Structures are given as C-alpha cells and as structure tokens.
Amino acid sequence: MNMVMLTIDGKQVQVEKGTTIKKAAEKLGIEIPGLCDDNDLKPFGACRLCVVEDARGNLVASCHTPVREGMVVKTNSPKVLKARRVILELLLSSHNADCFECDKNLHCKLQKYAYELNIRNIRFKGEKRNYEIKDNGPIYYDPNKCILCGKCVRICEEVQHICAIDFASRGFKAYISTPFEKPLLESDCIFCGQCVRVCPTGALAEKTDIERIYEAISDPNKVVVVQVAPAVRVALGEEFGLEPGEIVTGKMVAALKRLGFDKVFDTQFAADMTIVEETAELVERLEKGENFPMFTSCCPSWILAVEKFYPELIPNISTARSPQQIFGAIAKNYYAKKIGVARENMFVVSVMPCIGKKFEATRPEFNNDVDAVLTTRELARMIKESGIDFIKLEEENFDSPLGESTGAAAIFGVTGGVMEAALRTAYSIMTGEELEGDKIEFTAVRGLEGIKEAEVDIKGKKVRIAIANGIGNAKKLIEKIKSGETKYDFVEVMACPGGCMSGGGQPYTDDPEFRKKRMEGIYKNDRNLPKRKSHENEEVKKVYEEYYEKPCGPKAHEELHTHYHSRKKEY
Amino acid sequence: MVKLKSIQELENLREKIKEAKKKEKIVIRICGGTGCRASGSLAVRDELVKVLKREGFANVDVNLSSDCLENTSEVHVKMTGCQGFCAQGPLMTIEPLGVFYVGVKPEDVEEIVEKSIKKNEIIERLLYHDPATGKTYVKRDENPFYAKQTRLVLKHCGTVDPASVYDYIAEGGYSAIAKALTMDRKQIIDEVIKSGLRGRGGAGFPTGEKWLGAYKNQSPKKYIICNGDEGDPGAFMDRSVMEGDPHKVIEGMMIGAYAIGSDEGYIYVRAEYPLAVQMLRKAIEECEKLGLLGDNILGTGFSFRLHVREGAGAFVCGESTALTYSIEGKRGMPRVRPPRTNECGLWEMPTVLNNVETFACIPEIILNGGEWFASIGTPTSTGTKIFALSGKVNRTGLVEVPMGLKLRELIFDIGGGIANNKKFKAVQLGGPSGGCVPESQLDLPIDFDSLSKAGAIMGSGGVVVVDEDTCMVDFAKFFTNFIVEESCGKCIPCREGNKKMLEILERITEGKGKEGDIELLEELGDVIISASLCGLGKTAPNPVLSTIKHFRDEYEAHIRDKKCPAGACQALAAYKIDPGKCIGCGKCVKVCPVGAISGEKKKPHVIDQSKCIKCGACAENCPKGAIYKG
Amino acid sequence: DPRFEKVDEILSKLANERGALIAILQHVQHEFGYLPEDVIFYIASKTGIPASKIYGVATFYAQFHLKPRGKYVIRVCLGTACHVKGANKILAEFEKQLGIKAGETTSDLKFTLERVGCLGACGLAPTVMVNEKTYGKMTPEKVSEVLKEYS
Ligand SMILES: NC(=O)c1ccc[n+]([C@@H]2O[C@H](COP(=O)([O-])OP(=O)(O)OC[C@H]3O[C@@H](n4cnc5c(N)ncnc54)[C@H](OP(=O)(O)O)[C@@H]3O)[C@@H](O)[C@H]2O)c1
Ligand SMILES: Cc1cc2nc3c(=O)[nH]c(=O)nc-3n(C[C@H](O)[C@H](O)[C@H](O)COP(=O)(O)O)c2cc1C
Ligand code: HC1
Ligand code: SF4
Ligand code: SF4
Ligand code: SF4
Ligand code: SF4
Ligand code: SF4
Ligand code: SF4
Ligand code: SF4
Ligand code: FES
Ligand code: FES
Ligand code: FES
Ligand SMILES: [Zn+2]
C-alpha cells in the first residue's frame, strides 16, 4: 500500500500504485464514458471513447493507463468532447436503426451515450452494414447492430474457458462468428448465456415465446399453470425502480394472478422433492461405495459440458431430473388426474432466470413436459404491457396443494445452497436426530470463492466435499481429481460464476456490487421461513404416500430419472 | 566443413581460402537479383557455361564450395546479388579487364567470349550510352550513377556469392564476432552508444538505449527478433540485403545476442520472397555445419540458435506487438501499452526488435570503431541510408548516399532528370505513411530533424517521382484506398474514418463533390491522427493532408469547376468537337446511348455538356477523330 | 478420408516447435491446393487449438483461401511505381475479357485473378506475372494476344 500524487481537474487525489486513471478519477465523482471495458475483463482499448488530455497535450486512453507521480489530467476540455462526438458520429453513421423494433430499447448503452453526448445531426452518410440473420436456437444474433467491442469473445475465452466464438474477416467487414457460420448447437457452445449478459447493444438477444402463451390463454379448452424460480423473487423488483435483493414474492404472485394464469405454484416444492431423491441416492451410493465422486445434475449447461468435453464422467452423474422437469411431470401426471383434466389440455409455463432451460425444455427425452419457458425480463415486459402497477400491489399467497415450501429450498439461487440443503437432509438421514440452533448453517461452504472445500464430520464419519462455481473452476477441479491428488464423495458444479443469481435471464444492472446484494437478499429470505429442512415438508409426504410410495421406486425411477448420452462429434 | 574449436583456426583457414581464391585468373560476375532474373540471367549463365564447355574450357564451375578449394580453375563463373543498377539488366563484369557490360543477351555470349575473353577487347554497342550526353562509360565507378554513392552496407554486395560461406570468409567477414568474444558486454554496448547509431525502421529510436534497457533486466530468458517484413510497396531494400549477404545480418544478430545475453533468436521474413528465405535457410544450415552456431561457440561458452518464421501477408504484421502475436500464432491485432515489448514481449519475456539494416551495420562499428562512424552525416544523426528511387525517372535502382545529401542532386544528378523531357511535380517520401513534397522544397537536406520539421517522415526509404501528367486527387485516393484495404479493424477511428475519407475522395473525384468537403476531410484526419491506437492509423491521413496543404487548387478546380487540370479523371472529361476537322459523319450521334450531340449532316456538331455521360464512345468510334479529350 | 494420413504426415514434422499454427496452415494449403473444412476440424481435434481460433486466423490473412482455384493464376502488380503508368487499365482489360472480377475465379475454367502488390521487378513498367513467368512492359492491347496464346 504505497500512495501516489496526481492532479485531476485541479483536485489532489490519493491512490495506490497501479490504479488506472479511470479508477482514480472515480473517487472524485467523475464518470468517464466507455463501451469496451467491464468489471470482469481486462482493458481492451477498442472504443477509444475514454480519452483524456494530459499536460503535454495528447489524447490518452484512461482505461489502461497506469498512474504516475506529478501527473496533470484534464477530462472535460473541448478537444476531448469534440473527439468523442466525432467517434460516436462515426459509429452511428453505419448503424441499422430500428430502435422501434429493438429488444434492447430503453436499455441500450449506445442510445444513452448518443443522448448524453449531444448528437443531433450526422454528417457522414453512406455505406452501412448489411448481413443475414439466422436462428441460433435460444440466442438471437443480429450482426447489423454490432459495434465490435469484443466483450462476448473476451468473456467466453478469459472467464468461461470454452472459446466457442472469435473474430472473423478484417477491416470494415469484420464480424463475430463460429467456424464456418455453423449453428451454435453443434459448435462448442454450452448455452450458459454470459455473452448475452454483457453485450452493450441489441446484437445479442433472446428468443421470445410470449405469443404462444397468449394464444394458449385465449384458448377456452386449456388450463394454464405457472411455476416461479427461487431467484426471480429477488431481482424482479429491480425492473420497477427498487434496489437489488428486495423481496417481491407477494407482489409478483398478485401480478401473475392478474395476468390471467389460472394456478400459480413455485418450484421449491420440486426442489425439496429433488433434495429427497438426491439424498437417498447419495446415501445408497455411500453404502455401496462405487462410482465416486458423484456430481449434481441441476445445471443444464454443466450437463452439456459433460456430454461434449468430458464424456467419461457420465456414469458418475446423478440421474435425478432438474426441479423444472420434475414439477412438469408432477403437474401433468398427478395433478391433472386429481383435478380431472386430460393430459393434452394442460399448459405449463415456467419463469426462469436461465438460458439453458430454454434449450433443456425441448429435449426429446422429456416427452414435452414443459410447453414454454420465460425469463425475468420477459415477465417484467408482460407486467408493464398489461398495465399493472407494481409498487402499490397487495400481497397474496401461492395456490394449493403444490405451493407450500420450506427454507432449505429457498437457497438454490446462490452457490453452495444445494450442498447445504443436501447436508442438512443427509445428517438427519444418517444419524436420526435433527440439527438445532446455529448448527443448521454450514458457514464453511458460503462465499464467492473459486473452489470451496470442506470436511463435515457426521458422528465420526468424515466426507470429502467440494463446490466449484464456474466452468473454468470446474475444469480445474476435474484436472485435480483425475490426476489422483485426492478423492471426494460429492461435488457441485454451476456454470455461472456466483450461482443462478448471475444468470443470463436476469435484469441488467450497473452497480458493481449486485452479487453481494442478491446473496444477502437470498440469505435473508431463507432466514425468515418457519421450516428449514426438506423432510419437514408436508405435501411431499402426501405425494409419496399416494402415488410413488417410496423414493427411488419403480414408478419414481420411471418418471423422476433420466439418462445421458455422449455428444462428442469426433472429427 | 569440419567443426572449429578455437578462434585462431578461423583466421588460419582464412589464409587457405585467400590462397585458393588467388589461384584463379579470370572471374565473371552475373547479377542474380530478382529484377535481372526476370530478364533471363539464368539463361545467359546457362548459355555461357555451355559455350565455355564446348570451347574446351574444362575448368568451369558455378558455385565455390568446400571441394572447390583443392581445384584450380582458369575461368570462374559467379552469381552475385543485385548490383544496384536495375534499369538495364542483366549486369556482367569481367576481370581483370574491368569492363562493365549492360543488356547482355544469350546470343551475344559467343561474341563476348570470342572478343572480351580471348581477345581482351571491348564492344561499344553493348556499353552504356547516356542519351542526355552521349558519352560512353567503361568502368562501373566512372558511371555517373555510382559516382556520388558511398557504399558501406552494400560493400560486399555484388562481389560475393550469397550461397557460399568461404567467399564471405575470404572478404574478411566473421572477424568482428571473434574480436568481440574477447571483450565485455558493456564495452560493446558503450561502443554502440558512442557510435550514434539510430534505428533505420522509421521511428528513429536509439538502439543503444534499448540495448542498455535489455541489459539491465535480470531475467532467465531473453529474445531477439530481426524484422524483414517490408510491407511498403515500392521498397526493396532489405530484400536485396538478404539476397546479397545473409551472413552480415547473421553476424550482427550473434553480436547483439552476445551483447545482451540471449541464446535464441528469430528472423521474420515474408513467405512471398522465395529467394530470400531459401538463401537465409542455406546460410543458416551452412553456419551450423561449420560450427559457428550452437553450443560452446569457439570454446567460449556462448550459445545461440536461429529460427526462420515465414510471414503470411498483412501489412499490419510489421508492428511490434502484431509481429509477436503473428509469431506466437494468433491474429495480428496490436495490444495496448504499457507494458512495452522491452519489458515483456514474446511469451511474456523481454525482447529486442530491430531492422535488418540496423543489424547489418553492427560488425562495421565493432571493427572500425564508433568514432569513425560518427564522422559521417549530421552530428545528431550519423551513418548512411539506402534509398530505392523509382517512378517517372530516367534511371531506377538502389542508391546509397551519406545521410545529409540534398534532394535536388539525388533526384536529378543521380536520376538523370525526368523521363520524356517533362516537368517535375512532386516526390513521395516514406510510402503510405509519408507526405508529398513539391518542387519548391527540393533544396532540403535529408535527415530526421528536417523531415520531421517539414511534416514528412523518413519511412521505409522509398522515393517515387511524378510529373505534371498525374492528378493529385487520384494519387491521394489511391493511397487512401491502399490504407483502407490494409487496415485490421479493431478500433473505431481508423476502421470507420478511413472508409469515410475514401468515400469522400471518391465522391469528389467522380464529379459529385460538394462545397465544404475539404474542411470535413481535415477534421476527420485530425481526429483519426489524435485518437488512433497503433501506428498505422496515426499516419494514415498524411498523404491526403499533405496533398491538401500543397495542392489545394486541384481540389478547388475539381469541386467548383467540375474540371480536372491534368486531364486524368475520366468522369470529368469534356470532349470538344473541332469544326475544321469535322466532316459531319454523325457516328458520335449514332453510337452514344444518350445522344447529347445534335447537329446537321456535313456540318460541325455541338456537344451538350449537360446531357453527356463522358463514356468516351464518341471519340473512339469516329474515323476522323476530331473530338479531342479537352 | 485417406487424406487424414497425409495431414498426420506433416502433423509430426512442423509441429515439434512452439506455436506453429500458421506453418501448418501453409503446408496444408500447399498440399491440398486449397484449405478445406474437415482438415481444419481434424487439426483442431489433434492439436488442441479450438476451431474458432483456426477459422479466425484463416480468415484474417488474404493469402489463405477456403475455395478451390484454377490452374493458371494471374497476378497484376498494382504497386506505387506501376499504378502511375496505367496498371488499372490492364486490370480493367483483364476483368472485361475474363468476365470475372479481381479475387474471384472462373472455376468452371482454369483461370484466376489476383491482386499481389509490388512484385520483385519494379523497372519493367507494370508487371503481369502469370503462373511462374514475368512479362514486362504491358499495353491494354497485348491482353488479347496473350490470352489467346494461353487459351
Ligand atoms: N513501413 C514502415 O517502415 C513504416 C510504416 C508506417 C510507419 N512507420 C513508422 O513506424 C512508426 C510507428 O512505429 P511503432 O508504433 O511500431 O513503434 P513506436 O511506438 O514508434 O516505437 C518504436 C520502437 O520503440 C520501442 N520501445 C521499446 N521500449 C521503449 C520505451 N521505453 N519507450 C519508447 N519506445 C520503446 C518500441 O517497441 P514497442 O512499441 O513494442 O514497445 C518500438 O520497437 C511510425 O511513426 C512511422 O514513423 C514505418
Ligand atoms: C504499420 C506499421 C508497419 C511497420 N512495418 C515495418 C517493416 O516492414 N519493417 C520494419 O523494420 N519496421 C516496421 N514498423 C516499425 C516497427 O514497429 C518497429 O518499430 C521497427 O522494426 C523497429 O526497428 P528499429 O528499432 O530498428 O527502428 C512498422 C510500424 C508500423 C506501425
Ligand atoms: O432446475 C432447476 Fe434450479 O441448483 C437449478 O439449478 S435453482 Fe431454479 O433459483 C429454476 O427454475 C434457477 O435459476 S429451480 C434452476 O435453474
Ligand atoms: S453462451 Fe456461453 S459458451 Fe456459448 S458463446 Fe456465450 S459465453 Fe460462450
Ligand atoms: S456481439 Fe455484443 S458483446 Fe460481442 S462484440 Fe458484438 S457488441 Fe460486443
Ligand atoms: S442496439 Fe441500441 S442504438 Fe442500435 S437499434 Fe438497438 S437500441 Fe437502438
Ligand atoms: S448456474 Fe443456474 S443460471 Fe447458470 S446455467 Fe446453470 S442453471 Fe442456468
Ligand atoms: S489504427 Fe487501424 S490498423 Fe491500427 S489497430 Fe486501429 S484499426 Fe487496426
Ligand atoms: S468525329 Fe470528327 S468528323 Fe465525326 S462528327 Fe465528330 S468532329 Fe465531325
Ligand atoms: S460520350 Fe458524350 S460527347 Fe461523346 S457522343 Fe456520347 S454524349 Fe456526345
Ligand atoms: S473503455 Fe477505454 S478504450 Fe474502451
Ligand atoms: S537485380 Fe540486377 S541490378 Fe538489381
Ligand atoms: S511497384 Fe510494381 S513491382 Fe514494385
Ligand atoms: Zn483530376
């Protein structure tokens, strides 16, 4: 910690050595514009829109310039403003401008910068960008709106370590493409959605399914049911002017009821069911002591990565379905018979903060259990379209009999929650007594680190457990495990860094501390429930005693389990 | 070709090579350069050797090799590099007659052998006759082209077989490294600094400062890179340097590696140059076989290895970080600074990147001393430079002059005036990154300071001369189009502004220009220069800005009057019908799709400039051809 | 495919060094005439480099092309010393006679156009180099006779 002296706009500043001009001037309440830099990535130097003027009189980029003693910097001289205006005019001279038709309307950064830096008349009119738009599955790519900032390539290469996309061509005709413009499905993409989360323009977007939902609601011979993800209730309020991490569960239930859905449920019931199934499977595997370690299967992107890159780990993957598909099977196989509705006349809609769920819902092995999948942004758009005000709503509760949940299933939206809940159930199953007091929380698996390791002692038996949030950390853990350095018993993997609260379907943010706020909100929501264990749920016991009669039973194995196949297209 | 284990053994074998060379009597040199090879010098050599074999000359050989040291040959046939005067190749020299022959034809070989070889005579019809004066010159040095040239880097060029190492040894080479191996690194570095050497790649950054900075770094591994990309069209200096004597640059690279302490090095060459890469690989393999490259060189303990990396295109790959990325195997996109390549370059290790010409001059400084070198040229910039002058000039070739010679005698005295007795207009210095110099500034001496003062840059070193025939707007458009084509497209300013400027220039040159375009062009150039990332976009608008500064009247005529003063823009041609030479053929009226010409038969016709498309169909189709492009 | 053995033949020669993707691409182009798709995928599988990097490198440089060419490739200088003396008219004559733009081939036939800049000889007016021989001084009228001589 050694400090340096500098003058920014006539004000003395104390910053540590190595800090750039941008981070040094941030402490004076000055925001320098920039489009190609993000808090997760190294500086690139492509937009050239953050230039400042030093004492000599030259323009220098302030995003990758280290600080020095005795430096004089000017940030709002007329020359800098003129250069920024010219650069933005150069960008906007070759933009296809359907801001009426653009999904990123009122959320674009190029539009906001064009407004703020006072552009009203483009002098450069001529050749534009013109390409062809092709379907890439659940991701929509329009190369006519690209500004070539490299954020998607950098996030896919530096952080995710997948390297599914790169630059193509050179000069005015450069663009982002997969090898030979092949569709993303058979490329090395695993459908995590982090590239869609950082794009500053409307080039990368989502595939919408709202029209099918509206045409199924208007159908007078169908019943529509909806399920809500645990992580949607802490980030939905951001779209309506609230702070991150504020619970809007009752408001969102009331809004969904006002939208026309006949029955509103939650996925945490399926989360408890999956917890019970997985804990029973883990106990049986530990008794047998075969096929170690055991990996979870709740993340579709992790399953895709296993199928594509590591096809030798398939026997070690847990066969339990994800909570979404389990809920779909429950609704279309048990609830319909109780109510008296034919299987062909029931519609199931899910609201998820993920993008791999859109692809997962269309897999042939699930027999079309879930008919449509939405995101948080799509739900917010629907709520705003219908005209409901969100601030002044009245709190309501979930429907019956698949609405009540516990606290162990409320922390699946953050990294390490699934492991904590599994340990909570496994301690009770193995020992027979219930944890009381502060022993319920396992503080050794909480945080935002890369690889988290722990050793929980259960009545004299020690289990080696691990958690790895992120694809890169997952690859590192796999390399560590395969070499035989150490042996584990249960491993969790999540494709997004920080858990499902950082998914590609969450509302856009500008605060650099959204992860901490959302994690705090999730933990606070967990702390305010009457039940904190999965086996204390009441409707799960009824479902077992009425339809399946035992976990891992023949009917359960037929309807609540799945199998995986290798997708490795050898070349 | 046995291995060597002592420094003195090299000088011991030098005397044997000298005696073997002295055993010869007659030597003939033929230019093996690309320009002369395009004229058929290989066929000339084949015919000459065939005639010598027929004439009973049993001792005739082409290449001087290790087995040739024991053979005494009465007549020797050589194949050297580019001799410098490419205007009237092929070039042949006969010794000890000292006769300089130009335009040698295979069917003249028999007469040359009969007279120049057997009779010791000269044929005036094959000697150089300057059309300006008519005087006949015999010796090469007596030629006015070579009179003003002080060849220092090209001292061995044109007289040493590039494919033979023993020939290089016989000329005194490989002694600078032997002398340096007995001295300390600091002595060599300080000698280089005192020599006043500066980079020949255009930037002008001192070499001694970079070498000291590399020396002060305590790292296990260091690298050296030799740059021979030559992305500038019209410049063929390092091409001829590599095709003439790769051993000089190899010796310079070894000296630099010893000075800074690096055991590895690379030579970046473009794969488009087959002769250069073949010669470099042959020289490297010969040097490795001889034992001068590898481990424990001459029993000292110095280790060095050399590698060749063939280039694959882009003009932007010459930039230092782009070059390192291309060597590693990625896209040649420049990265952001700091850090610089002198602290962490190739594979995050310190590197030293220099030009071919810079590495070629190190052995001369080592042998003769830096104080002798510093006595030539301006005190702030010593040494000499190699210039490749071409264009609309009488004599084209590779010239070498002391650094500081005035431009007027460079253009006129050496170049022999302007061809076709036209009037000089301007010269382009530096290539696409340089500016345009009019006739009013021909009295300017050449050095970094004066050229930087005048808005131009040294550049690669290419000189192009243009006369009054060419249009300046079209020249600027051509340079802008080349810059647009050679961009890489990473940052907004270069990628967008270059195409915008090209569009504006095309609009101006097609006759659709509007008032106020010059100020917009100047603003775009200023912004692009100020806010670009690498050095390619910062120097891009220089040809346009210089042309605007010096030839604004051309732009004014093109925009306001819709007329081209030089008559080179087709879209602004204004055909005129001469009443005197017209016969009323009416072919122009018939063949023109729009028919802007209306008139009576057997009478002169009138051209309506409003309804004309200026496609040239009228002039080329009428037999009289009275319609002239005015 | 039987060419996967030919690929493996050079995957062991020019791949003992560090960072030799461009050399491998050049050797593949030399052997196969052009640069195909399954060869890229085989290189990606057998070398570890993801196919996106290889595709980007191939699409960066203009030397590499991913489509078969003709037999006789034509090159025009279009340099700073030949553009002055009417090389553009030579290129226009070639385009008019062959019916194909520069950089595009007549694959049905065996001809091809190219835009290689500043060949070795700069003193021989504008310089058109077909295949492996140098022409020298050129005029828009010699185009017809030279094309007739080859065709
Ligand atoms: N065809 C040609 O020959 C041609 C064409 C266009 C332009 N140019 C010339 O090239 C110039 C731009 O060249 P460039 O941008 O590549 O080089 P540059 O930034 O001008 O600097 C030239 C040299 O300085 C080196 N260097 C190392 N340590 C340094 C330090 N501490 N401070 C400063 N420099 C250091 C640079 O390496 P790093 O940059 O790797 O650090 C590089 O080798 C133009 O201005 C133009 O004059 C030449
Ligand atoms: C666009 C561009 C092209 C360049 N091309 C070359 C080149 O062909 N040869 C060369 O020696 N230097 C070139 N340079 C300069 C190199 O960056 C490098 O500075 C030079 O090789 C340094 O050698 P020096 O230290 O001897 O000057 C180029 C720079 C730029 C920006
Ligand atoms: O399926 C499932 Fe679930 O370790 C998981 O994963 S957590 Fe959910 O806050 C939902 O819907 C979310 O997001 S229920 C899923 O993705
Ligand atoms: S979805 Fe994930 S893997 Fe696919 S391109 Fe985007 S960041 Fe890469
Ligand atoms: S697609 Fe989006 S993130 Fe990727 S380069 Fe284009 S604008 Fe940037
Ligand atoms: S990307 Fe931004 S600027 Fe472009 S059309 Fe969409 S909202 Fe408008
Ligand atoms: S971690 Fe959650 S949001 Fe991210 S890919 Fe997996 S399921 Fe989707
Ligand atoms: S200035 Fe031009 S050549 Fe240089 S990095 Fe930017 S776009 Fe590429
Ligand atoms: S070409 Fe000559 S003769 Fe024919 S119409 Fe024109 S001026 Fe008259
Ligand atoms: S080209 Fe113009 S001048 Fe000639 S015939 Fe046609 S319209 Fe008349
Ligand atoms: S944010 Fe600094 S160059 Fe883009
Ligand atoms: S190539 Fe023969 S004189 Fe230059
Ligand atoms: S400019 Fe034509 S070959 Fe060099
Ligand atoms: Zn003109």
Automatic annotation (TrEMBL), chain A:
Name listed for the protein in its UniProt record: Electron bifurcating hydrogenase subunit HydA1
Signal peptide location in the record?
Answer: none
Keywords from UniProt, A to Z, are: 2Fe-2S, 4Fe-4S, Iron, Iron-sulfur, Membrane, Metal-binding, NAD, Oxidoreductase, Repeat, Translocase
A biological-process GO annotation? ATP synthesis coupled electron transport
Binding positions ([4Fe-4S] cluster 1): H95, C99, C102, C108
Q: Which organism is it from?
A: Thermoanaerobacter kivui (Acetogenium kivui)
A Gene Ontology cellular component where this protein is annotated is: membrane
Boundaries of every 4Fe-4S His(Cys)3-ligated-type domain copy:
79-118
NCBIfam families according to UniProt: FeFe_hydrog_A, FeFe_hydrog_A6
Query: What cofactors does the UniProt entry give for this protein?
Result: [2Fe-2S] cluster; [4Fe-4S] cluster
What does the entry list as the binding residues for [4Fe-4S] cluster 3? C156, C189, C192, C195
Q: Which residues form the 4Fe-4S ferredoxin-type domain?
A: 137-167, 181-209
The residues the record assigns to binding [4Fe-4S] cluster 2 are C146, C149, C152, C199
UniProtKB/TrEMBL annotation, chain B:
Which Enzyme Commission number(s) are listed? 1.12.1.3
Q: Which InterPro entries does the record associate with it?
A: 4Fe4S_Fe-S-bd, 4Fe4S_Fe_S_CS, NADH-UbQ_OxRdtase_51kDa_CS, Nuo51_FMN-bd, Nuo51_FMN-bd_sf, Nuop51_4Fe4S-bd, Nuop51_4Fe4S-bd_sf, Thioredoxin-like_sf
Specify which residues bind NADP(+) according to the UniProt entry for this protein.
Answer: F205, S320, R337, R340, T341, N342
Q: Which residues bind [4Fe-4S] cluster 1?
A: C488, C491, C494, C534
Record carries keyword Kinase: no
Q: List, for all copies, the residue spans of the domain called 4Fe-4S ferredoxin-type.
A: 573-602, 603-630
Which residues participate in FMN 3 binding? N227, G231, E319, N355
Q: Where along this sequence does the record place binding of FMN 1?
A: G201, K210, N227, E230, G231, N355, T358
What start-end ranges are recorded for coiled-coil regions in this protein? 3-30
Residues that, per the record, bind [4Fe-4S] cluster 2: C582, C585, C622
Keyword Ribonucleoprotein among record annotations: no
Task: Write out the residues that bind Zn(2+).
Answer: C471, H558, C564, C569
Entry binding sites for [4Fe-4S] cluster 3:
C592, C612, C618
Q: Which domain of life is it from?
A: Bacteria
Which Pfam family is one of this chain's hits? 2Fe-2S_thioredx
Q: Which residues bind FMN 2?
A: G201, N227, E230, G231, G318, N354
Q: Where does [2Fe-2S] cluster bind?
A: C31, C36, C82, Q83, G84, C86
Main EC class of this protein? oxidoreductase
- Which keywords accompany this UniProt record? 2Fe-2S, 4Fe-4S, Coiled coil, Flavoprotein, FMN, Iron, Iron-sulfur, Metal-binding, Nucleotide-binding, Oxidoreductase, Zinc
Task: Give the family, as the similarity comment puts it.
Answer: Belongs to the complex I 51 kDa subunit family.
Q: Which NCBIfam families match?
A: PRK13596.1
Q: What is this protein called?
A: Electron bifurcating hydrogenase subunit HydB
Provenance organism:
Thermoanaerobacter kivui
**Could you tell me the gene encoding this protein?**
hydB
From TrEMBL, chain C:
EC number(s) given by UniProt:
1.12.1.3
GO molecular function annotation: 2 iron, 2 sulfur cluster binding; hydrogen dehydrogenase (NADP+) activity; metal ion binding
One Pfam short name? 2Fe-2S_thioredx
For this UniProt record, the keywords arranged alphabetically read as follows: 2Fe-2S, Iron, Iron-sulfur, Metal-binding, Oxidoreductase
Obligatory cofactor(s): [2Fe-2S] cluster
Q: Which domain of life is it from?
A: Bacteria
Q: How is the cofactor bound?
A: Binds 1 [2Fe-2S] cluster.
Q: Which InterPro entries match?
A: NADP_DH_HndA-like, NuoE-like, NuoE_dom, NuoE_N, Thioredoxin-like_sf
Q: Which residues form the signal peptide?
A: none
What sort of enzyme, by top EC class, is this?
oxidoreductase
- PANTHER family associated with the record: BIFURCATING [FEFE] HYDROGENASE GAMMA SUBUNIT (PTHR43342:SF1), NADH-QUINONE OXIDOREDUCTASE, E SUBUNIT (PTHR43342)
What family does this chain come from, according to its entry? Belongs to the complex I 24 kDa subunit family.
Q: What is this protein called?
A: Electron bifurcating hydrogenase subunit HydC
| Lineage of the organism | Bacteria, Bacillati, Bacillota, Clostridia, Thermoanaerobacterales
Query: Which gene name does the record give?
Result: hydC
